[PDB]
Design a protein around this motif. Structure first.
Motif, mmCIF file in Angstrom:
data_model
loop_
_atom_site.group_PDB
_atom_site.id
_atom_site.type_symbol
_atom_site.label_atom_id
_atom_site.label_comp_id
_atom_site.label_asym_id
_atom_site.label_seq_id
_atom_site.Cartn_x
_atom_site.Cartn_y
_atom_site.Cartn_z
ATOM 1 N N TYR A 66 20.919 34.643 -78.043
ATOM 2 C CA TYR A 66 20.742 34.963 -79.452
ATOM 3 C C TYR A 66 20.574 36.469 -79.561
ATOM 4 O O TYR A 66 19.603 37.030 -79.040
ATOM 5 C CB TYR A 66 19.547 34.222 -80.040
ATOM 6 C CG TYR A 66 19.756 32.730 -80.086
ATOM 7 C CD1 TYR A 66 19.565 31.950 -78.953
ATOM 8 C CD2 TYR A 66 20.162 32.103 -81.254
ATOM 9 C CE1 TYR A 66 19.756 30.583 -78.982
ATOM 10 C CE2 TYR A 66 20.359 30.734 -81.296
ATOM 11 C CZ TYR A 66 20.153 29.981 -80.152
ATOM 12 O OH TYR A 66 20.347 28.618 -80.175
ATOM 13 N N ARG A 67 21.536 37.122 -80.202
ATOM 14 C CA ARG A 67 21.689 38.562 -80.111
ATOM 15 C C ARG A 67 21.652 39.213 -81.485
ATOM 16 O O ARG A 67 21.953 38.590 -82.509
ATOM 17 C CB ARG A 67 22.990 38.922 -79.390
ATOM 18 C CG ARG A 67 22.816 38.914 -77.888
ATOM 19 C CD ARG A 67 24.059 38.465 -77.171
ATOM 20 N NE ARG A 67 25.085 39.488 -77.067
ATOM 21 C CZ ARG A 67 25.127 40.421 -76.123
ATOM 22 N NH1 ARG A 67 24.173 40.498 -75.204
ATOM 23 N NH2 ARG A 67 26.129 41.282 -76.104
ATOM 24 N N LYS A 68 21.297 40.498 -81.471
ATOM 25 C CA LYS A 68 21.013 41.280 -82.662
ATOM 26 C C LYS A 68 21.993 42.443 -82.757
ATOM 27 O O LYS A 68 22.292 43.097 -81.754
ATOM 28 C CB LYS A 68 19.557 41.784 -82.619
ATOM 29 C CG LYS A 68 19.151 42.747 -83.723
ATOM 30 C CD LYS A 68 17.613 42.872 -83.823
ATOM 31 C CE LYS A 68 16.921 42.897 -82.449
ATOM 32 N NZ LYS A 68 15.419 43.116 -82.536
ATOM 33 N N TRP A 69 22.512 42.680 -83.962
ATOM 34 C CA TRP A 69 23.377 43.821 -84.232
ATOM 35 C C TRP A 69 22.869 44.570 -85.450
ATOM 36 O O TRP A 69 22.565 43.955 -86.478
ATOM 37 C CB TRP A 69 24.831 43.399 -84.487
ATOM 38 C CG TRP A 69 25.582 42.996 -83.261
ATOM 39 C CD1 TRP A 69 26.336 43.798 -82.462
ATOM 40 C CD2 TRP A 69 25.675 41.678 -82.711
ATOM 41 N NE1 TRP A 69 26.888 43.064 -81.436
ATOM 42 C CE2 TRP A 69 26.497 41.758 -81.570
ATOM 43 C CE3 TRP A 69 25.137 40.439 -83.069
ATOM 44 C CZ2 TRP A 69 26.791 40.650 -80.783
ATOM 45 C CZ3 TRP A 69 25.431 39.340 -82.288
ATOM 46 C CH2 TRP A 69 26.252 39.450 -81.159
ATOM 47 N N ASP A 70 22.799 45.896 -85.338
ATOM 48 C CA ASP A 70 22.580 46.768 -86.483
ATOM 49 C C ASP A 70 23.948 47.099 -87.067
ATOM 50 O O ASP A 70 24.758 47.783 -86.427
ATOM 51 C CB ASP A 70 21.823 48.028 -86.068
ATOM 52 C CG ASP A 70 21.651 49.028 -87.209
ATOM 53 O OD1 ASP A 70 21.904 48.683 -88.388
ATOM 54 O OD2 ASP A 70 21.245 50.172 -86.919
ATOM 55 N N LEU A 71 24.217 46.606 -88.270
ATOM 56 C CA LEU A 71 25.502 46.824 -88.916
ATOM 57 C C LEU A 71 25.430 47.875 -90.016
ATOM 58 O O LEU A 71 26.365 47.977 -90.818
ATOM 59 C CB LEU A 71 26.043 45.502 -89.468
ATOM 60 C CG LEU A 71 26.206 44.402 -88.409
ATOM 61 C CD1 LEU A 71 26.900 43.185 -88.991
ATOM 62 C CD2 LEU A 71 26.957 44.916 -87.187
ATOM 63 N N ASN A 72 24.347 48.658 -90.057
ATOM 64 C CA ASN A 72 24.117 49.702 -91.058
ATOM 65 C C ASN A 72 23.977 49.106 -92.457
ATOM 66 O O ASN A 72 24.056 47.885 -92.628
ATOM 67 C CB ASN A 72 25.232 50.757 -91.031
ATOM 68 C CG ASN A 72 25.433 51.372 -89.646
ATOM 69 O OD1 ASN A 72 26.561 51.488 -89.170
ATOM 70 N ND2 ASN A 72 24.339 51.759 -88.998
ATOM 71 N N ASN A 73 23.738 49.962 -93.457
ATOM 72 C CA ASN A 73 23.524 49.532 -94.843
ATOM 73 C C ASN A 73 22.402 48.500 -94.953
ATOM 74 O O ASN A 73 22.423 47.632 -95.831
ATOM 75 C CB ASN A 73 24.819 48.987 -95.464
ATOM 76 C CG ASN A 73 24.770 48.931 -96.986
ATOM 77 O OD1 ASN A 73 24.046 49.693 -97.628
ATOM 78 N ND2 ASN A 73 25.539 48.017 -97.569
ATOM 79 N N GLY A 74 21.414 48.579 -94.063
ATOM 80 C CA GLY A 74 20.302 47.653 -94.111
ATOM 81 C C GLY A 74 20.609 46.261 -93.613
ATOM 82 O O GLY A 74 19.831 45.339 -93.869
ATOM 83 N N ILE A 75 21.715 46.085 -92.896
ATOM 84 C CA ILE A 75 22.165 44.779 -92.421
ATOM 85 C C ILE A 75 21.834 44.651 -90.942
ATOM 86 O O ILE A 75 22.264 45.477 -90.126
ATOM 87 C CB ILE A 75 23.672 44.590 -92.656
ATOM 88 C CG1 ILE A 75 23.994 44.753 -94.140
ATOM 89 C CG2 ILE A 75 24.137 43.241 -92.107
ATOM 90 C CD1 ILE A 75 23.284 43.759 -95.026
#
Length: 356
Positions: free
Chosen positions: A194-203
């Motif tokens: 279970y992995r996490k991504w910072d996609l910018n714009n608060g996402i």
């Protein structure tokens, strides 16, 4: 894949030319938030199978899970402290590769507060592989024919389930992650990151990714089976005649005629961080029998190098996903549906009744 109704409202139409220009560069590798399950080790004797030394495909007595995002208890627990967008690798792959898709498909999106949940509907054709979907002339046969699109789909899916397990060392101890499988030998060998991504714009995206096996180089594998039904009827290149002598041509034909299937497999491996994509080549024993199959060989590719071969651009993949996320975040809470138009190069976001 689903019948549009009069009470559905079109939120936005997204054509493939527009989606193909999207780009979100600089997205790092996913960060593990939680790992669970346990995978069996790959059986390297299957790397020595070849056309002159074929291996019958076995029927594997295992249950093959496909749990959607909101039915995943790890996602529900993690959502209390992590992220604001949730999905699985297979759901993300469908969105990220939508401009390669031809056959219709759908994904349910529920917005709850400031959180988005991407789901798939069970027992639909979402969990079925396609066959020759991107050919100039896709398969045309009608219902009963073993070469109809749906029967080809059922066959390829059955092959893939069996193949992924057959090439593993089933009576040996597994590589165990820290937590147990959240869903359960009776089950398919699989381990989840279970992995996490910072996609910018608060996402911040949280998503279930997976490996099918481990391999001593510890390397983690995504294992899939390419399949041959009837090369002559497919206007393809015959694997028994060409795999040894024109391996590049055999693969090039697969790239063009199964383009969406292969791109989604590659996304799955990229998201999970698999070190290797392992492809089996499975063909019918005889062309009018879809019950018996043989493994003709296996091939191995680094996912990032394979992505280059298929012009899979993850900057675009992430760009498409953030486009859809940004639109959904601008909507009210409720249930939405994104679906590929069967006859047009576009996907549509609908507002659907929450009871649908």
């Amino acid at each position: 894949s689903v019948t549009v109704r009069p009470d559905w409202v079109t939120i936005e139409e997204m054509d493939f030319p527009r989606l193909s220009k999207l780009t979100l560069p600089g997205v790092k590798e996913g960060e593990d938030v939680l790992c669970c399950g346990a995978v069996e080790y790959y059986d390297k004797s299957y790397d020595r199978v070849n056309v002159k030394n074929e291996k019958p495909l076995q029927r594997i007595d295992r249950i093959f899970h496909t749990v959607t995002t909101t039915d995943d208890p790890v996602i529900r627990k993690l959502s209390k402290t992590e992220g604001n967008v949730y999905a699985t690798d297979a759901i993300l792959a469908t969105i990220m590769c939508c401009t390669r898709s031809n056959y219709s498909w759908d994904i349910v999106i529920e917005k709850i507060g400031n959180k988005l949940f991407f789901d798939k509907r069970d027992n639909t054709e979402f969990d079925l592989l396609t066959v020759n979907e991107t050919s100039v002339e896709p398969p045309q046969d009608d219902g009963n024919s073993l070469n109809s699109p749906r029967n080809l789909a059922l066959e390829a899916t059955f092959i893939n389930h069996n193949f992924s397990q057959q090439v593993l060392k089933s009576n040996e101890p597994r590589y165990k992650f820290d937590e147990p499988n959240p869903f359960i030998g009776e089950v398919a060998s699989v381990a989840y990151r279970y992995r996490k991504w910072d996609l910018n714009n608060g996402i911040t995206l949280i998503a279930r990714c997976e490996h099918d096996a481990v391999m001593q180089g510890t390397q983690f594998l995504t294992i899939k089976a390419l399949n041959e039904w009837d090369s002559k009827l497919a206007n393809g290149v015959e694997w028994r005649r060409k795999l040894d002598t024109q391996r590049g041509a055999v693969l090039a034909n697969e790239l063009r005629n199964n383009a969406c299937k292969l791109a989604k497999w590659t996304v799955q491996a990229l998201l999970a961080g698999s070190d290797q994509l392992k492809f089996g080549y499975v063909s019918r024993a005889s062309v009018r029998d879809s019950s018996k199959h043989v493994i003709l060989e296996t091939q191995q590719y680094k996912p990032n190098e394979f992505a280059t071969q298929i012009n899979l651009n993850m900057d675009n993949a992430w760009g498409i996903l953030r486009c859809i996320i940004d639109i959904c975040m601008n909507q009210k809470d409720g249930k939405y549906l994104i679906m590929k138009d069967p006859n047009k190069p576009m996907i549509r976001l609908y507002d659907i009744p929450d009871n649908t």
